[PDB]
Amino acid sequence: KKRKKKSYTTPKKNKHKRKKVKLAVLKYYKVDENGKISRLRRECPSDECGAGVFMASHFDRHYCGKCCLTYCFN
Amino acid sequence: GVMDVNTALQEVLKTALIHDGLARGIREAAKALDKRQAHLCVLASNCDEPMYVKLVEALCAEHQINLIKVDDNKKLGEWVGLCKIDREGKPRKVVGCSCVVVKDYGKESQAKDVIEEYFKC
Numbered sequence: 001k002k003r004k005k006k007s008y009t010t011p012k013k014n015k016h017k018r019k020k021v022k023l024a025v026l027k028y029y030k031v032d033e034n035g036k037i038s039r040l041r042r043e044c045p046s047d048e049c050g051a052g053v054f055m056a057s058h059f060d061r062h063y064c065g066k067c068c069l070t071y072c073f074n
Numbered sequence: 075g076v077m078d079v080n081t082a083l084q085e086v087l088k089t090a091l092i093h094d095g096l097a098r099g100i101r102e103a104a105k106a107l108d109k110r111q112a113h114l115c116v117l118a119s120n121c122d123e124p125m126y127v128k129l130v131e132a133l134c135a136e137h138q139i140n141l142i143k144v145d146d147n148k149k150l151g152e153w154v155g156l157c158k159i160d161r162e163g164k165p166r167k168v169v170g171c172s173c174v175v176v177k178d179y180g181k182e183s184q185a186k187d188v189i190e191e192y193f194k195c
């Protein structure tokens with residue numbers, strides 16, 4: 001019946017705010033001066049993860065995000 | 075009678091919209107192009123970002139897909155249904171790929187045919 005008074009356990013956990021990125025320019029690279037696009041990111045080797053999807057490049061490892069398939073640099 | 079490109083485009087885009095297709099925005103339009111599910115591309119003019127338009131020409135050229143260069147991207151937003159709310163809202167859509175044929179599986183209108191007739195020459 002009393003108030004929670006839960007100030008002992010944390011000061012309110014912040015929720016996640018996704019950082020806003022403008023476009024997907026960094027993925028493709030035409031700029032060959034000869035209309036030759038070069039893909040700056042690997043693509044996924046899964047069946048439902050064809051040419052459209054790509055795979056992220058952290059300081060190590062390659063990560064998909066769609067099927068969560070990971071290839072460590074090593 | 076006369077069915078010039080700037081009036082058959084509205085018909086074909088709408089008719090696709092009833093039957094899916096119409097990959098709006100640079101994302102998922104690049105996906106349709108790379109996945110080779112695209113049959114027509116509609117890039118809008120007056121796009122400030124040069125890399126945007128240059129990359130979409132690159133994609134269309136390498137994938138050997140026709141490209142229409144309309145102006146006033148807001149009009150493209152009207153045409154692809156981004157407006158809604160009677161005739162308010164109106165977000166710009168400066169690129170769109172017509173998946174599953176230029177037309178759609180529902181109907182094959184001659185307004186689709188004028189597009190390929192104009193693109194053949």
Ligand SMILES: [Zn+2]
Pocket residue numbers: 044045046048049053064065066067068069
């Ligand atoms: Zn994947």
